[PDB]
Amino acid sequence: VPSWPQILGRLTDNRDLARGQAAWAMDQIMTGNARPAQIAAFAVAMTMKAPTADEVGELAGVMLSHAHPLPADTVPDDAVDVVGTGGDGVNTVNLSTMAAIVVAAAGVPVVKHGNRALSGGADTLEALGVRIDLGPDLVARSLAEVGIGFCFAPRFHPSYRHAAAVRREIGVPTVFNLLGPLTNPARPRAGLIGCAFADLAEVMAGVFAARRSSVLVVHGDDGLDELTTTTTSTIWRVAAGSVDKLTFDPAGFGFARAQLDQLAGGDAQANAAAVRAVLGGARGPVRDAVVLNAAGAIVAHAGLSSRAEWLPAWEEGLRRASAAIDTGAAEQLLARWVRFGRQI
Amino acid sequence: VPSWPQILGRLTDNRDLARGQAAWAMDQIMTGNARPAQIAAFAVAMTMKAPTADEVGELAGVMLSHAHPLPADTVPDDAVDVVGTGGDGVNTVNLSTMAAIVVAAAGVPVVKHGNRAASLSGGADTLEALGVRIDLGPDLVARSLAEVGIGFCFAPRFHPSYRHAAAVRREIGVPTVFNLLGPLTNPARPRAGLIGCAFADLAEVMAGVFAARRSSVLVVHGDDGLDELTTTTTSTIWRVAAGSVDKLTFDPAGFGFARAQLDQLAGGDAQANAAAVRAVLGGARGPVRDAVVLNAAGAIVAHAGLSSRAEWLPAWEEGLRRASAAIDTGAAEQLLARWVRFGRQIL
Ligand SMILES: O=P(O)(O)OC[C@H]1O[C@H](OP(=O)(O)OP(=O)(O)O)[C@H](O)[C@@H]1O
Ligand SMILES: Nc1ccc(F)cc1C(=O)O
Ligand SMILES: Nc1ccc(F)cc1C(=O)O
Ligand SMILES: Nc1ccc(F)cc1C(=O)O
Ligand SMILES: Nc1ccc(F)cc1C(=O)O
Ligand SMILES: [Mg+2]
Ligand SMILES: [Mg+2]
Ligand SMILES: [Mg+2]
Ligand SMILES: [Mg+2]
Known part of the structure; x- marks a missing residue:
């Protein structure tokens, strides 16, 4: 009892x-x-x-x-999420959201779960003119027609309202902060999953392992809930029901070490302008971090139809992520996503 | 901020x-x-x-x-409390309440802070079944204290602004740090006490709070889990005096008390527990009396600590003798009757 x-x-x-x-x-x-x-x-x-x-x-x-689920057979088998627990306390630019656009532009289906924040991923997308508030049917159409969709958490999880209110009232981070990444209503099988809490990343990885997902759970060794450029990161690689924990260093792919302040964001408008800068080809620390996280997502996606080994997958991911930006594909995809929203 | x-x-x-x-x-x-x-x-x-x-x-x-405080100059300088956190899970007869009556009958003023269970039957519930009015405001508690030698501060009467906390406590059910607050917030502020703690890890914190106040208190935990001095085994006592705490292991066998079993101290509803009070005050011998005498002696020892630092073993001997005499002279039975009479005079 x-x-x-x-x-x-x-x-x-x-x-x-x-x-x-x-x-x-x-x-x-x-x-x-x-x-x-x-x-x-x-x-x-x-x-x-x-x-x-x-x-x-x-x-x-x-x-x-x-x-609320998405309709039967509207989510491709190889869709990927790019999403974090948040709460790293460093108020970064929206790295996961930018990476998700880049990954989609590289040709990988993306269904992102997200929420408002302090400009959160949903706030920034809204400030870019993307429709964040779509129901199951229109998310599935977004995915089919644009190659990306966004599940706004309050729209898909109405019964969580009592918990969400308690979370706001107490403010302190809890076990509930882990659930966002774990309850994407489209249930993609692959993901780049950020955890701000070093000791809980392993727990999140264990949950994904029991799902047969191909996921990289990542924690910057500077506290970021993203793959960071300022130092190493810990990665819990999940595939085939098991976990392979490792230390990841982006210097190995030639990334210069950045400073954390160079990744700081602002309000919705500022973070939207950071998105447009990156997608337009502006080089710098922010692009580097976007490219790095986009590649990580591409690697997790590769883990589904798992041809490639780790290093070659990373090299391929970085090349596809950079090309998606440099060829204008990412800028174009965002414009396409905004148009989609405006067509009713 | x-x-x-x-x-x-x-x-x-x-x-x-x-x-x-x-x-x-x-x-x-x-x-x-x-x-x-x-x-x-x-x-x-x-x-x-x-x-x-x-x-x-x-x-x-x-x-x-x-x-709400009691009125100025109405609590004696040397008043004592006999109260625990509850939550020992054992549903005993109301040991603190019986001890309080004996202590007051021995001539030590008692102002008891308490509450309902709110089960099977808490101190407040048993007093009520005995015909004591538990629901009195400051002026009448003060009067009871002056006229009978004992008073009872009903927690919801004296701490109305705690109602938000109390509702949450009931909603979550689980014991928290808030379970410590009752013994620490007696509105009469007696400076001495026998304070039971059902949570062994927190008894030392309660002691420290009394020490910061320079109270003369014994904070007690039976090693069988009781929030009272037990007769079924040893007890841990944090003795607070002169603004300092030291931890002691207490064995009642050393005063000639036989070991009892828990079930010999088991309570029932308010009526059964009332009958147990009446049996003990009437001079019935057995394990309930033994437990009452022991806890009464402890409060008396704490009270002595207000004006002494007398030796431990003698203090206990006298405490036990005073508690026994209070019952056997009829004084305790008489005090309860005076207390019941006082409440009936209010109308
Ligand atoms: O319901 P529980 O959490 O087990 O608590 C049992 C009783 O213990 C405490 O009182 P006190 O020590 O004043 O009364 P008692 O020892 O005479 O019962 C509490 O206020 C209850 O009256
Ligand atoms: N962190 C999250 C990630 C995804 C999501 F849908 C909600 C949250 C959240 O915390 O509200
Ligand atoms: N229902 C919700 C589901 C997820 C969420 F992040 C917030 C809410 C909310 O009601 O505020
Ligand atoms: N107000 C209170 C003060 C103390 C207490 F134990 C309970 C209440 C209550 O409202 O139930
Ligand atoms: N246990 C207690 C001891 C004294 C008191 F005033 C209140 C309580 C209680 O928790 O209701
Ligand atoms: Mg993120
Ligand atoms: Mg982040
Ligand atoms: Mg008690
Ligand atoms: Mg008790």
């Missing part, structure tokens, strides 16, 4: 939950049956205990069972 | 708060400005980080500042 006092007691006692308990909690939360105080207690207690991959899998799984 | 994200982030990092942060959080909670989610996040985060005496002192001090 599950209950709040039982589950919360177990977590405050610093014990892992029994199987099913996390799912019960999340389902109470998703059906509107949990009091705000219970939601907050659970989010915090799970965080301070240190969630396991099995527990987070229950959370994300239950949350997905309440999401 | 203190804020929830700043304070909760600190706690979730496993760091002690900066000075004043716990006080800010408690101000928010006591003014109705903290959302239920913020209250619960804070209660839980403070519990899992492991609260310090300074943090809990801030919570308790702000809480006391919002409480």
Whole structure:
């Protein structure tokens, strides 16, 4: 017989939950049956205990069972996401969002899950004239006609509203901050997944491993929830139900070391102008980081029909990402995406 | 600017708060400005980080500042409390309440802070079944104290601004640092006490808060988990005197008490527990009496600490003798009757 006092007691006692308990909690939360105080207690207690991959899998799984799906057979088998936990506290430019446009322009289907923020990916896309607010059918059409779509989290996860409000009221990051990347309603099988929390990246990787995804979970060793250019990054490579953790250094591909301030963003307008600069061919630290993350996504996608080995896949990813920019394909794709939105 | 994200982030990092942060959080909670989610996040985060005496002192001090006080010059200088955190999970007979009556009958003024269970039957519930009026305001508690030798401050009467916290406590069910606040926020501010703690890891923090106040207190945890001095085994006692704490292991066998079993101290509903009080005050021998005598002696020892630093073993011997005499002279049974009579005179 599950209950709040039982589950919360177990977590405050610093014990892992029994199987099913996390799912019960999340389902109470998703059906509107949990009091705000219970939601907050659970989010915090799970965080301070240190969630396991099995527990987070229950959370994300239950949350997905309440999401609006995309229609049958509208998401290609090899679609990729580019998305992070956020909360790295460094207010960067929208690296994942820029990378996603570049990856799509390179010919890889992209279905990005995202949200508002502090200009978040959704805010920046909105400021660029992209329609962020589309329902399942129109997202699937975006994907078919433009090669990219965007699932706005509030539109696809209406039942999460009680949790979202508690997250706003308490402000502190929790286990819930992990769920965004794990509950893309289109369920792409590949992804470049950023984690700001060094010790939870491994947990996120474990969740993806139990899905058969081909994913790179990445954490900049400077704290970025992206592949960084200022130093090394830790990568948890996920494929075939297993994890291969490694240290990644972009100097090995000839990237100059950048400073973190050179990647700082601003409001929606500033971050939109940064997008247009990069897609127009402006060289510099921001382009470098976009190219780096776009290549990472391309590598994860390569992991699905896994011909290539790691190094050759990276070399191919970097070349495709750079060419997608330099040939104007990325600029053109964004314009195409905006036109699509404007056609009703 | 203190804020929830700043304070909760600190706690979730496993760091002690900066000075004043716990006080800010408690101000928010006591003014109705903290959302239920913020209250619960804070209660839980403070519990899992492991609260310090300074943090809990801030919570308790702000809480006391919002409480109704007794009127000026109505609490004796040497009043004592006998109270625990509850939450030992054992559902015993009301040991603290029985001890309080015996202690007052031995001539030590008692002002008890308490509440309902709100089960099977808390101190407040049992007193009510005995015909004691638990629901009295400051002026009448003061009068009871002067006329009978004992008073009872009903927590919801004296701490109305705590209602947001109390509702959250009930919603989450799980024990938190807030479970420590009852014993630390007696609105009469007695300076001595026998204080039970059901959570062994937190008894030392409670002690530290009493030490910062220069109270004479024994904070006790039965090694069987009871928030009282037990007779089923040894107890841990943090003795607070002269603004300092030292930890002791206490064995009642050394005063000639036989070992009892938990079930010999098991409670029932308010009526059953009332009958247990009446049996003990009537002079019935057995394990409930033994437990009451022991806890009464402890409060008497704490009270003696106000004006002494007398030797431990003699202090206990006299405490136990005074508690036994209070029952066996009829004084305790008589005191309860005087207390019941006082409440009936109010109309
Ligand atoms: O319901 P629980 O969490 O187990 O708590 C049981 C009782 O212990 C505390 O009181 P106190 O020590 O004043 O009363 P008692 O020892 O006489 O019952 C609390 O206020 C309850 O009255
Ligand atoms: N971080 C996220 C990533 C994707 C998403 F859809 C939502 C969030 C979020 O935190 O609100
Ligand atoms: N329902 C939601 C789902 C995801 C999210 F990030 C926010 C909301 C919200 O209601 O604010
Ligand atoms: N106000 C209160 C003060 C103390 C307490 F224990 C409970 C309440 C309550 O409202 O239930
Ligand atoms: N346990 C307690 C001891 C004294 C008090 F005033 C309140 C409580 C309580 O938690 O309701
Ligand atoms: Mg990102
Ligand atoms: Mg980021
Ligand atoms: Mg008690
Ligand atoms: Mg007790």
